[PDB]
Amino acid sequence: KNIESLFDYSAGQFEFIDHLLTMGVGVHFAALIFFLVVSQFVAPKYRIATALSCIVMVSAGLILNSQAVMWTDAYAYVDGSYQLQDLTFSNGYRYVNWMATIPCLLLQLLIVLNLKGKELFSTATWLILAAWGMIITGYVGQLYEVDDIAQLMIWGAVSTAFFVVMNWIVGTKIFKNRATMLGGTDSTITKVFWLMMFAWTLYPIAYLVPAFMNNADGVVLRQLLFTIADISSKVIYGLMITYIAIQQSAAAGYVPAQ
Ligand SMILES: CCCCCCCC/C=C\CCCCCCCC(=O)OC[C@H](O)CO
Numbered sequence: 001k002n003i004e005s006l007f008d009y010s011a012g013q014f015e016f017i018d019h020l021l022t023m024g025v026g027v028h029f030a031a032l033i034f035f036l037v038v039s040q041f042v043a044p045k046y047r048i049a050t051a052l053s054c055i056v057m058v059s060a061g062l063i064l065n066s067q068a069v070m071w072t073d074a075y076a077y078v079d080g081s082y083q084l085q086d087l088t089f090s091n092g093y094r095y096v097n098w099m100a101t102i103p104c105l106l107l108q109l110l111i112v113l114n115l116k117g118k119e120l121f122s123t124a125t126w127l128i129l130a131a132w133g134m135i136i137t138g139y140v141g142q143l144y145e146v147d148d149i150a151q152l153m154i155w156g157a158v159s160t161a162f163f164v165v166m167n168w169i170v171g172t173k174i175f176k177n178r179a180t181m182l183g184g185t186d187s188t189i190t191k192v193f194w195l196m197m198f199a200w201t202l203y204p205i206a207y208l209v210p211a212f213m214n215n216a217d218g219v220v221l222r223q224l225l226f227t228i229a230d231i232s233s234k235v236i237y238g239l240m241i242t243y244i245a246i247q248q249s250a251a252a253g254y255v256p257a258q
Pocket residue numbers: 156157158160161164167168169170171172175176
């Protein structure tokens with residue numbers, strides 16, 4: 001049901017798509033080590049936040065590594081072009097990985113925002129439930145990205161309603177709680193929010209490639225878009241989240257931080 005099956009791929013497009021997926025694997029398992037090492041320099045209050053990045057890094061690296069092997073098993077160079085052989089490559093694997101990493105990415109945001117008790121459990125439920133609705137409706141629409149572009153749009157519209165509400169919650173919790181953050185992190189968190197608004201919006205852009213660029217280069221463009229957003233929403237995001245966690249741990253008196 002995905003457009004990846006409709007086209008033959010020259011050796012250049014195929015190996016380029018293969019090098020984007022495997023490169024992601026290394027970048028994510030490389031950042032994992034980093035997020036693993038610096039956790040000792042994070043006070044216990046925020047130490048959970050860096051651990052979630054470690055979880056996020058592994059969750060993403062396993063699907064990318066799976067996507068790569070699934071990419072090289074499904075196609076075979078025949079008569080000058082890589083042609084589909086078996087059907088085992090699908091973007092759906094991504095959406096099942098967003099269901100897991102998105103909650104972890106949202107959790108670590110609220111942890112550095114210094115929410116606790118009622119609000120943490122409450123804000124986390126509406127956000128996770130809001131995201132899960134976004135990812136699921138979007139997963140139903142991409143099943144029609146080959147057959148019914150109309151349905152892709154309709155489900156894309158619904159999915160965007162969830163996305164809009166989610167950010168309003170995130171943005172509202174941020175701008176109303178940054179005055180409680182230490183070490184000047186009240187300024188850095190605002191940038192992280194703008195880092196979110198940009199990196200997260202690249203996903204719907206790739207979601208619509210079947211609609212405005214239906215060809216083998218649109219598939220290369222999609223993975224390139226997924227790759228850019230994936231490194232920003234998870235790696236750079238986790239790094240930015242780590243720094244805020246460390247910076248505040250230092251201002252709170254934690255000696256390792258500091
Ligand atoms: C189906 C297509 C529907 C398309 C619909 C498009 C409308 C999107 C408009 C705004 C996005 C909201 C972005 C969230 C910005 C958060 C700002 C905020 O939360 O408000 C300020 C805060 O309260 C300070 O205290």
